[PDB]
Coordinates of C-alpha atoms in Angstrom, one line a residue:
Chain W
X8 CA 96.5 93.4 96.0
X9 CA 98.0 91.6 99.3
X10 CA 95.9 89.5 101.2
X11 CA 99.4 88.8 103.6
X12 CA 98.8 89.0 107.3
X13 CA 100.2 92.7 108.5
X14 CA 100.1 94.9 111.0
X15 CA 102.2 98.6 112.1
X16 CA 100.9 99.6 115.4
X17 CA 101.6 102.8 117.0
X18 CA 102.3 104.3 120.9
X19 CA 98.5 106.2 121.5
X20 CA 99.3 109.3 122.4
X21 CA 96.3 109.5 124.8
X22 CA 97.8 106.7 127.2
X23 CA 101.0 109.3 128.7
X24 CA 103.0 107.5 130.7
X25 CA 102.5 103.9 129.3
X26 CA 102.9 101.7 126.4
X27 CA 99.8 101.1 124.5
X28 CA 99.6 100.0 121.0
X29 CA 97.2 101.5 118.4
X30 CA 96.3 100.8 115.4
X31 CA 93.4 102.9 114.5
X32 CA 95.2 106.0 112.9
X33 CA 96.2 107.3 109.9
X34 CA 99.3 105.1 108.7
X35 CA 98.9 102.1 111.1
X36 CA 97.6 98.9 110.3
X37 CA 96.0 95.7 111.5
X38 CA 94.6 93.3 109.0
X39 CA 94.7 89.9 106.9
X40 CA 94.2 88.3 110.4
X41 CA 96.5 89.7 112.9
X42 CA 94.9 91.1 115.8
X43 CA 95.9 93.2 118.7
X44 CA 94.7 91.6 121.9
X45 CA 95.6 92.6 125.5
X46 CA 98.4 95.0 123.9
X47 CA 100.0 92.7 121.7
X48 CA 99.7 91.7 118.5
X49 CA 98.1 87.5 117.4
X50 CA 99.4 85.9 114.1
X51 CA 96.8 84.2 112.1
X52 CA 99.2 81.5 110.3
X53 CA 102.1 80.0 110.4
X54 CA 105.1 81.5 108.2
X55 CA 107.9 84.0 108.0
X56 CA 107.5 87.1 109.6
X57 CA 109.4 90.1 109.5
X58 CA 108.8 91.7 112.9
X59 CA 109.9 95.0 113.9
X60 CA 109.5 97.9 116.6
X61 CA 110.9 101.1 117.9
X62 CA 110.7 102.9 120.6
X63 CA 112.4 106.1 121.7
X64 CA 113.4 107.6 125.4
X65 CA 113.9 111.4 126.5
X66 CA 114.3 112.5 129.7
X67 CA 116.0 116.1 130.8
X68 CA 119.5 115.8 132.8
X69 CA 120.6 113.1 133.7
X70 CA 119.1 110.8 137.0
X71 CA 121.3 110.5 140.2
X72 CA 121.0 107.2 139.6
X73 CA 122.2 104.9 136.6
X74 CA 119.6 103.8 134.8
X75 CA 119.5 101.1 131.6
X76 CA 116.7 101.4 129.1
X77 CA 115.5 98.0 128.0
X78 CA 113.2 97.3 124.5
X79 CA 112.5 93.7 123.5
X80 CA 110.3 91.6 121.5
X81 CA 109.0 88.6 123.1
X82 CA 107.0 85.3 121.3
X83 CA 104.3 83.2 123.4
X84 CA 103.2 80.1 121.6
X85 CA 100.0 78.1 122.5
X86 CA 102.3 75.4 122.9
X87 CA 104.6 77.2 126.1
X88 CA 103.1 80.2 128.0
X89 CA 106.6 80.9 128.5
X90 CA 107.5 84.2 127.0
X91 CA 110.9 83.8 124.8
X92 CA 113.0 86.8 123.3
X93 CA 113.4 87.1 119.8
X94 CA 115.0 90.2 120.0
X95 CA 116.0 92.8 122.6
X96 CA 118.9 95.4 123.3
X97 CA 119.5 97.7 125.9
X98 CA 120.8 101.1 126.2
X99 CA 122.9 103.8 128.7
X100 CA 121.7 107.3 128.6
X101 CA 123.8 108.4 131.2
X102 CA 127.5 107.9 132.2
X103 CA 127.4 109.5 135.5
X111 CA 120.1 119.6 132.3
X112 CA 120.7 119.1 129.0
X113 CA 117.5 116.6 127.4
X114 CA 118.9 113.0 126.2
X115 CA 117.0 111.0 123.6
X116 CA 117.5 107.5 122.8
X117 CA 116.2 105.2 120.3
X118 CA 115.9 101.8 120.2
X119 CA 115.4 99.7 116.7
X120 CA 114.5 96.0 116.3
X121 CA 113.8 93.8 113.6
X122 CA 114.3 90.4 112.4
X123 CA 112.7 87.5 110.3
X124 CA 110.9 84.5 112.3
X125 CA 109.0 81.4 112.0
X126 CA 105.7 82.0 113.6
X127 CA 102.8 79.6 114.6
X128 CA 98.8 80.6 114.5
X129 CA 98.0 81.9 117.7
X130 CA 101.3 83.3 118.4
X131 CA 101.3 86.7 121.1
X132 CA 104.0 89.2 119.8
X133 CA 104.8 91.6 122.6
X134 CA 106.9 94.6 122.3
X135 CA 108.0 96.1 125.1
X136 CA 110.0 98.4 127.1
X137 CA 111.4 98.7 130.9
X138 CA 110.9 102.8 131.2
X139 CA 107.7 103.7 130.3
X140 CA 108.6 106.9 132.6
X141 CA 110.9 107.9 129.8
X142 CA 108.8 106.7 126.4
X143 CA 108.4 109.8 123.9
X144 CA 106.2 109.7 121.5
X145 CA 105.1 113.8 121.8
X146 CA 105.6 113.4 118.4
X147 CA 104.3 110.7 115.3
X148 CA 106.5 107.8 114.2
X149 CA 108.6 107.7 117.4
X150 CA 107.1 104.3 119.1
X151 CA 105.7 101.3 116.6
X152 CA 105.7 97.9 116.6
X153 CA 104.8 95.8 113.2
X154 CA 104.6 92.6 111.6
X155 CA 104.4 91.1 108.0
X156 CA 103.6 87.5 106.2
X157 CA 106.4 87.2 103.9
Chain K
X8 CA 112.3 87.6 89.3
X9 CA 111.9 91.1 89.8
X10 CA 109.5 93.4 88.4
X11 CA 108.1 94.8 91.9
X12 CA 108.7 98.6 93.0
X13 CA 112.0 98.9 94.7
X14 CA 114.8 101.7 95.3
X15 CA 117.5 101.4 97.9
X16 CA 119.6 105.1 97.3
X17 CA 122.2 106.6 99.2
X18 CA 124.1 109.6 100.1
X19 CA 125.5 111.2 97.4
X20 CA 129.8 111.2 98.5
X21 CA 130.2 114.4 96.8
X22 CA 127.8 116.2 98.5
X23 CA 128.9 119.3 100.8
X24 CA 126.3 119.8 103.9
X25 CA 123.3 118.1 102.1
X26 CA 121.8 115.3 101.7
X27 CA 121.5 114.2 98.2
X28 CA 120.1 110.9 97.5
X29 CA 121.7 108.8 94.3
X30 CA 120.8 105.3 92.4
X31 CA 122.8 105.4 89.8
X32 CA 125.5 103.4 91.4
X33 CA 127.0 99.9 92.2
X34 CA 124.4 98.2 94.7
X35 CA 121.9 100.9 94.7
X36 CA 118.7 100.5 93.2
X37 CA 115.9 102.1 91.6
X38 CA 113.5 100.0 89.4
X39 CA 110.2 98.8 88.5
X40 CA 108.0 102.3 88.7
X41 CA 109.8 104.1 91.6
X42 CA 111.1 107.0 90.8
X43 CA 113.8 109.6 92.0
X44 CA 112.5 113.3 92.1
X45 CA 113.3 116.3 94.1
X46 CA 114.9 113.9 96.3
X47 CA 111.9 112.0 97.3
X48 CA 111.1 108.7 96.3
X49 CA 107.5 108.3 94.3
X50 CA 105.4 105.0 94.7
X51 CA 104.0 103.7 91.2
X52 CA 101.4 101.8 92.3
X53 CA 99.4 100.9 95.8
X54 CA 100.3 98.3 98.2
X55 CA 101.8 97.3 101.2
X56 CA 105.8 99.0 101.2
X57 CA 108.8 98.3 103.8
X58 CA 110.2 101.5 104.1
X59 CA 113.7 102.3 105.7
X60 CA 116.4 104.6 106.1
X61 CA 119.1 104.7 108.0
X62 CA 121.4 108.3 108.6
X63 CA 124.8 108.5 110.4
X64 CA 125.9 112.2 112.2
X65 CA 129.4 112.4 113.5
X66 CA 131.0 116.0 114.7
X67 CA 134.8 116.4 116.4
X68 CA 133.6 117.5 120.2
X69 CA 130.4 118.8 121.9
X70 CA 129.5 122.6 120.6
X71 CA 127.8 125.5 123.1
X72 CA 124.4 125.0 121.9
X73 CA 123.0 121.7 122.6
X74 CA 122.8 119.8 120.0
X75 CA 119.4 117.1 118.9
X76 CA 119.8 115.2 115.2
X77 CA 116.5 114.2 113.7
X78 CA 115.5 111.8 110.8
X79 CA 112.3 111.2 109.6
X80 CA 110.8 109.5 106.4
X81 CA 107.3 111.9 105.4
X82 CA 104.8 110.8 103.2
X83 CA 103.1 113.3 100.9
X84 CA 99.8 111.7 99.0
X85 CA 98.2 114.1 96.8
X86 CA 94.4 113.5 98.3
X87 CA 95.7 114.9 101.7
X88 CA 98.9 116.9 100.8
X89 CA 99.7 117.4 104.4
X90 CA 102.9 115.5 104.6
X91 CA 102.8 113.0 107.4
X92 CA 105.9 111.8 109.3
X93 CA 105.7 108.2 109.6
X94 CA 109.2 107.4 111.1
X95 CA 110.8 109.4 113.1
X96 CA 113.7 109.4 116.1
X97 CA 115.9 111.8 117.7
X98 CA 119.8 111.4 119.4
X99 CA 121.9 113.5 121.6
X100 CA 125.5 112.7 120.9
X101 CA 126.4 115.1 123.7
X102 CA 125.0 116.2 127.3
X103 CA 127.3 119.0 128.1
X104 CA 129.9 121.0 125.1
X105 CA 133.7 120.1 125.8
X106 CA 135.0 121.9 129.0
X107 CA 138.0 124.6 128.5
X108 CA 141.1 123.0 128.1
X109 CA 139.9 119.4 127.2
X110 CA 140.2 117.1 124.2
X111 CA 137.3 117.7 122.1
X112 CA 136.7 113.6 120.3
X113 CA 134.8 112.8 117.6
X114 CA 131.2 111.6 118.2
X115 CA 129.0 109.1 115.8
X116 CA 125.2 109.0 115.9
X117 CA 123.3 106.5 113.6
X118 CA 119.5 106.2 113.5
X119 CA 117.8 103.6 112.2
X120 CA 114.3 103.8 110.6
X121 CA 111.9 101.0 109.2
X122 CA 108.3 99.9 108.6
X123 CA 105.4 98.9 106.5
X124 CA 102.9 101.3 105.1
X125 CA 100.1 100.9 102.6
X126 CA 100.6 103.7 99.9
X127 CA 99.1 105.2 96.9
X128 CA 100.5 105.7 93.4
X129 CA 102.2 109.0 93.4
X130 CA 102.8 108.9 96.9
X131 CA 106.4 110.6 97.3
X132 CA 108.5 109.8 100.5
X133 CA 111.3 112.6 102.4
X134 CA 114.0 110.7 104.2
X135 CA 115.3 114.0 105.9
X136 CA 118.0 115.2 108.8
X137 CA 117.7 118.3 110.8
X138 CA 120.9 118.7 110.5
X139 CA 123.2 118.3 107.1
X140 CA 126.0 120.2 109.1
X141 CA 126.7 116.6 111.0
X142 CA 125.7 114.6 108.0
X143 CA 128.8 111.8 107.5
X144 CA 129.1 109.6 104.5
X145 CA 132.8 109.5 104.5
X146 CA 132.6 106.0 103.9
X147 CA 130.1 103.5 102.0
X148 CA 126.9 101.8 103.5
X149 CA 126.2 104.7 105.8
X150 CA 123.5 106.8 104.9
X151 CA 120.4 105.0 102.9
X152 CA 116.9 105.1 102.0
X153 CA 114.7 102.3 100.3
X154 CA 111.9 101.1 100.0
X155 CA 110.1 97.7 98.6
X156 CA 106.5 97.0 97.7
X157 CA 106.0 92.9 99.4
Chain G
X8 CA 106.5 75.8 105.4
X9 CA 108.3 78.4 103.1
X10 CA 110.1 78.6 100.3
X11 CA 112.1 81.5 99.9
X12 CA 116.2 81.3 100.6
X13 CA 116.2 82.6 104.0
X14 CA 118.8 83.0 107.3
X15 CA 118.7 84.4 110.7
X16 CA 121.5 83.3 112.9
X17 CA 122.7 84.6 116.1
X18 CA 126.0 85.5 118.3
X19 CA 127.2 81.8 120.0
X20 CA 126.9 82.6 123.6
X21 CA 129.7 80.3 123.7
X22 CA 132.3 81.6 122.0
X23 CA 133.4 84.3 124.1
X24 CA 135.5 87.4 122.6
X25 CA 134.5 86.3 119.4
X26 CA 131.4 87.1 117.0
X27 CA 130.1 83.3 116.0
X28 CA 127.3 83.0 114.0
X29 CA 125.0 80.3 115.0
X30 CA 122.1 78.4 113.4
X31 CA 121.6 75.7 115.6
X32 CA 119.3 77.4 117.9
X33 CA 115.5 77.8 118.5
X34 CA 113.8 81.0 116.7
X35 CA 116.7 80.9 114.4
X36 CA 117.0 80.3 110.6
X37 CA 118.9 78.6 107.6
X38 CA 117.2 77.3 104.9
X39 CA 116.4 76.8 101.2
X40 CA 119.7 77.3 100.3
X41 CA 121.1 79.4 102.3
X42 CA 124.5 78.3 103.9
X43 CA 126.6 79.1 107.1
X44 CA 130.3 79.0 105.4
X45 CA 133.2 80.3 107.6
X46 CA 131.0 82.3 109.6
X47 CA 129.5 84.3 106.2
X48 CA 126.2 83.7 104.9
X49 CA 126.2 82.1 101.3
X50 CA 123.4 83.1 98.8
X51 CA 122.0 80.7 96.6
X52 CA 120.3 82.5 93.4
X53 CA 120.2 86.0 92.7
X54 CA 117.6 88.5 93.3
X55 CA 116.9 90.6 95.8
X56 CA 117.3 90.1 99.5
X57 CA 116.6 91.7 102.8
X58 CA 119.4 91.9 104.8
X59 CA 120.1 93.1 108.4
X60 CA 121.8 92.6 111.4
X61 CA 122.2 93.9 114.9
X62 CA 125.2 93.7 117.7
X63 CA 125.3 95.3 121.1
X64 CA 128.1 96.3 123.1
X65 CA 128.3 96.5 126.6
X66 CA 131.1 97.9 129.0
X67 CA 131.2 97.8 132.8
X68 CA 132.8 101.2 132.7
X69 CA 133.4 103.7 130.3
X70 CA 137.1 103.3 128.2
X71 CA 140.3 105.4 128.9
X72 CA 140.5 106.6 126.3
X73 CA 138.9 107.0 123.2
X74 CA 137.5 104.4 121.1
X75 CA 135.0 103.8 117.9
X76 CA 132.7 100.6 117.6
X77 CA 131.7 99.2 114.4
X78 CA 129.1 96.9 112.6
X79 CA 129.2 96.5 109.0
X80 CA 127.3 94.2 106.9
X81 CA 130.1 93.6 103.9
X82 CA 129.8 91.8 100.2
X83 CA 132.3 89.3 98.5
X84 CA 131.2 88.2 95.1
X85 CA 132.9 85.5 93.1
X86 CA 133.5 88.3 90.8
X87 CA 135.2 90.6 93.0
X88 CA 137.8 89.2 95.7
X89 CA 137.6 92.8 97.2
X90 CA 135.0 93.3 100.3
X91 CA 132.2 95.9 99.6
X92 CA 130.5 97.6 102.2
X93 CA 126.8 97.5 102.2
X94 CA 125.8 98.8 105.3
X95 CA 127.8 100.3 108.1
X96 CA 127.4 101.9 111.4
X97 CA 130.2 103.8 113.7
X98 CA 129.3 104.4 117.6
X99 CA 130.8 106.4 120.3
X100 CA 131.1 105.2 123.6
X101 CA 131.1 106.8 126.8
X102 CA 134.7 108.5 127.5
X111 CA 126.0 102.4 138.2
X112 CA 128.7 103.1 135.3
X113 CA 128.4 100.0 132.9
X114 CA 127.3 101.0 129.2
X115 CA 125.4 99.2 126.4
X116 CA 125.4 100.7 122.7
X117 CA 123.4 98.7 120.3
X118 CA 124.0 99.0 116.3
X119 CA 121.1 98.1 113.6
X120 CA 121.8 97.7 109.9
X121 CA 119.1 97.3 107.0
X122 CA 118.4 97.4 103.4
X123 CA 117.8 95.5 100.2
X124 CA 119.8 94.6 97.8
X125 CA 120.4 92.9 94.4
X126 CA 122.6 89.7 95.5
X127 CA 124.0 86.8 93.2
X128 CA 124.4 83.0 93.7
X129 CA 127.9 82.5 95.4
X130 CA 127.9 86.2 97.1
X131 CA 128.9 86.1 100.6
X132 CA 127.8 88.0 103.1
X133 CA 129.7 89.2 106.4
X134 CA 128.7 91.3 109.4
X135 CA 131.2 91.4 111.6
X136 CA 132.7 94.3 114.4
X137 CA 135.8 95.7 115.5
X138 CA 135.2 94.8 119.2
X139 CA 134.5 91.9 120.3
X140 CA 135.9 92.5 123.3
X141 CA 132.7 94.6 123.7
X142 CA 130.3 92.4 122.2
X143 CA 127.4 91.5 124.7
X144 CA 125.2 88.3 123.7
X145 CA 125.0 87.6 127.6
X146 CA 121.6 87.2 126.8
X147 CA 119.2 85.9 124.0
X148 CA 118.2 88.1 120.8
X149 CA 121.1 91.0 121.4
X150 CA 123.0 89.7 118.5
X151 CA 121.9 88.6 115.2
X152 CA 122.2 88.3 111.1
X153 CA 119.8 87.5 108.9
X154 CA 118.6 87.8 105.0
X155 CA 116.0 86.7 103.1
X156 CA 114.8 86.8 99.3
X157 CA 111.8 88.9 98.5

């Protein structure tokens, strides 16, 4: 088999309202090492990593106001506790009560360090929808 | 070289309103166990599998009814036949249909899916839209579904 | 530490109205064979790769009239002069007001040594790398 550090977290659906990785359910993961501490997830060793995450927004009609949905993957190394982004895009659901979604995809391939923090995360939590599985997930993989 | 599952299939361009996924084609792929059946792809052997797909919707105008366009990748394993949906998104391409008497343009949509998951020999994955109707592969590279075992 | 011909470049954030591809940069990639020729990425033995990319586009106000934005991700072997596309994308923008519409592009393919590899858009005058990890290309052998 694969002994390669991995992990494919997922929104819990008990935590409404907020942004909480999970990894005990069926068709998540979390093993060879990674860990998910404090809501994000710790490489084991350095290497490439494919890193990856989704999230989706809903909201019904659009807001009075004009609002920008952010989504981002961050790195923290033991060597700078200052958070850098690796990858991060932005969306516009409105251009001025019809229900909008919006989906955000991210994914690239990065050097990592042991004890790197992965964090994926959004601006909106308001707006986060995962009322149903495979909307919101966040993963990692040793290549 | 080689010799680990892999398929990378796309949209049939001579399908009408369906999705029909194809290999048998200049930079497709389907090799080393996977198979093509029933339009799912079925895993040869366990381990750890990137899956992706990505779908593109485009329609001239905003209709009446309000429209959502889904794609999802389902997993159907035989010990626990309830087929799971392990990627999944959603888009609104409009938020009102095109008011009397003004130019109805054409809207694109793509969704993007992608992620690892541990699966079982004879696993068989669904990359599937709500809506076929909206479905556009007019043009290479944009409707896709593959998977790779790492 | 690796091995295994890998590449993940970025927009230049200097190289405004244009879509650069940049190496020279922290958390990006270009190595074991991989090469950064006029602005395509070059493979160096065949097999199969992962390849993706992602742009975004940003507008402070919606366009007059109406307009399509594309990201494709296109082939050019030795063997073919002719541009294949392997992955492409078509978004339409909005006809307190700026927009942003992001594009992602993914799959795997069979690649041979000399194939070059483009992802490029129709507007840059949209493109946004105002800030870091908006814009990138990369591939990697599996």
């Amino acid at each position: 088999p694969s002994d390669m550090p991995v992990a494919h977290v997922v929104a819990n659906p008990q935590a409404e309202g907020q942004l909480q990785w999970l990894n005990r359910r069926a068709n998540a993961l979390l093993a060879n090492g990674v860990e998910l501490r404090d809501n994000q997830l710790v490489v084991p060793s350095e290497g490439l990593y494919l890193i990856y995450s989704q999230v989706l927004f809903s909201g019904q009609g659009c807001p009075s106001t004009h609002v920008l949905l952010t989504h981002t993957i961050s790195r923290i190394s033991t060597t700078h506790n200052q958070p850098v982004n690796l990858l991060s895009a932005i969306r516009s659901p409105c251009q001025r009560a019809n229900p909008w979604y919006e989906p955000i995809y991210l994914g690239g391939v990065f050097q990592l360090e042991p004890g790197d923090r992965l964090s994926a995360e959004i601006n909106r939590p308001d707006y986060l929808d995962f009322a149903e599985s495979g909307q919101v997930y966040f993963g990692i993989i040793a290549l």
